[PDB]
Design a protein around this ligand. Sequence first.
Ligand code: NA
Length: 184
Amino acid sequence: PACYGGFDLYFILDKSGSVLHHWNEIYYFVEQLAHRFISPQLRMSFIVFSTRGTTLMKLTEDREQIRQGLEELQKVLPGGDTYMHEGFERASEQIYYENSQGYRTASVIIALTDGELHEDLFFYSEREANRSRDLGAIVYAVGVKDFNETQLARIADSKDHVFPVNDGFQALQGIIHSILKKSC
Ligand code: NA
């Protein structure tokens, strides 16, 4: 698959208890990237996870829906366990559905998290992120706090795909460059 005509962005956002003082950083990354142009065929989805993984806004190219979705993200109060594997399950379900319809788009997952996962929860996040990659998704991890980059490199496609959220304006540019390289 050398290039694609359109790109679907999947934000998978950690709203567990360990990221409480950092939700604003997570929101602001998402809000800055959600506003960029990226592609003439840009759709995005907002997925949040803590005790479960929930699709807060289904894939859409409509700016008003995105705007409302950003408003629900401003309301988030972090708390609970860190079930990141369900977050990926939510994106993989939307991905498989879209390719099942006559839709050939690239899938880009952006997972924002502190990486603070017990071994079992990490074990199944890695498996579900590998499940997304078989679905053709490219996975980036945007690390929050003093994130463990060795763990995130296993969730993301590589160490190349792990960026700190604190300098993520540079990371946005880096993520968007990879989209452009793969843009027919
Ligand atoms: Na966490």
